[PDB]
Amino acid sequence: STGSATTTPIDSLDDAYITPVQIGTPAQTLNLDFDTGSSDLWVFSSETTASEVDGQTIYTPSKSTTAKLLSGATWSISYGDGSSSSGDVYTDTVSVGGLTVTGQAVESAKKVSSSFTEDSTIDGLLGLAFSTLNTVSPTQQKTFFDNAKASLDSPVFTADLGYHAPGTYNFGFIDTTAYTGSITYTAVSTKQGFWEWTSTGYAVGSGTFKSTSIDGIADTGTTLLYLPATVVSAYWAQVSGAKSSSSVGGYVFPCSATLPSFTFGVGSARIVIPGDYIDFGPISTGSSSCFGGIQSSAGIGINIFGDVALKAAFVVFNGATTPTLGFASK
């Protein structure tokens, strides 16, 4: 089997991407944030504290003839920004782009933190990291991809995020029309439960490529590109007036600037992020200071190849017995 679903930016900045997912019988369609940096499929639901729902579409398990409470199971998760959610668990039928999993753990939110409430466009998350990170207790649950894998034509999914435009998540096959050149594959460590890999270096604009190993994670659920302070300083030094602002929380730059591109290495291959992808717009409405899309990882403890990087590539998440990642230009 295979599946194919369109993923759409939630706003004009590509702050996140939502993909429609069918849950239950009859189907209830929710728009979920596919997150290769976590491993829980959780949704706003009829159980979510009412004051914490503000426009999201909710899953109502009582209206699904295939929903079954997973007795005794609870979940609770905290994300990189300090946001969080928690609740109980059902199993139900879940379909993505024509690919159906029965008995998928659907984690029903009883509580969500303010950043989730305030984003009416995201009805939940669909985790695509390794199932060892799933937070369900006392019986850990498998991700949608893990549950589908044996049925797929090939044990893979691909992320093809758009720049200010829709893109695609495919399950079970590699669309050879979706990229240019060849896909370069690189080793993955699953020891932290992430799609963790080592980039071979970087270049800023038309500058020379610096060969240096940068370990990081391929994370569709993080907006920006977080890299070591040395790398990020080298990038923003090429932008007149750019500076790191503690009050804003990162590098900012004059909105009048034209940003240089940023290249990262995948083995001997190179992925080029155009400068426009690094512009995240005014820090507040009407400001002439703009927020940068490349930021320091120094406070985070890990480098993160988020959407800014991933959207410049066609990305293969290969879930074979020995997982690997593939990147192609497009």
Ligand X SMILES: COc1cccc2c1CNC2
Q: Where on the chain is the footprint of ligand X (CB under 6 A)?
A: 16, 33, 35, 37, 79-81, 83, 115-116, 119, 122, 125, 219, 221-222, 300, 302
Answer yes or no: are the C-beta atoms of 128 and 139 closer than 8 Å: no
Q: Name the residue among 220, 185, 181, 213 with its Cα closest to residue 199.
A: 213
Query: Which residue's CB comes closest to ligand X?
Result: 80
Annotated catalytic residue: which of 45, 64, 199, 296? 199
Answer yes or no: are the C-beta atoms of 275 and 235 closer than 8 Å: no
Answer yes or no: are the C-beta atoms of 55 and 63 closer than 8 Å: no
**For residues 156 and 224, which CB has a smaller minimum distance to ligand X in the complex?**
224
The distance of closest approach from Cβ of residue 323 to ligand X in the complex, given in angstroms and rounded to an integer, is: 16
**For residues 35 and 146, which CB has a smaller minimum distance to ligand X in the complex?**
35
The distance of closest approach from Cβ of residue 133 to ligand X in the complex, given in angstroms and rounded to an integer, is: 9
The distance of closest approach from Cβ of residue 14 to ligand X in the complex, given in angstroms and rounded to an integer, is: 13
Among this protein's residues, is 35 annotated catalytic? Answer: yes
The DSSP secondary structure of 157-185, one letter per residue, reads EEEE--SSS-EEEEES---TTSSSS-PEE
The distance of closest approach from Cβ of residue 81 to ligand X in the complex, given in angstroms and rounded to an integer, is: 5
Among this protein's residues, is 154 annotated catalytic? Answer: no
**For residues 146 and 219, which CB has a smaller minimum distance to ligand X in the complex?**
219
**For residues 42 and 314, which CB has a smaller minimum distance to ligand X in the complex?**
42
Rounded to an integer, what distance in angstroms lies between the CA atom of residue 279 and that of residue 298? 21
**For residues 211 and 246, which CB has a smaller minimum distance to ligand X in the complex?**
246
Strand, helix or coil for residue 194: coil
Tokens, residue 79 = 């994300």
14: Cα separation from own chain's centroid: 11
The distance of closest approach from Cβ of residue 78 to ligand X in the complex, given in angstroms and rounded to an integer, is: 9
Collect all residues with Cβ–Cβ distance below 8 Å to 116 and sequence separation of at least 6. Answer: 44, 52, 83, 85, 122
**Single-letter amino acid, residue 112:** V
Rounded to an integer, what distance in angstroms lies between the CA atom of residue 151 and that of residue 144? 12
Annotated catalytic residue: which of 14, 33, 35, 119? 35
Could you give the residue numbers annotated as active site?
Answer: 35, 199
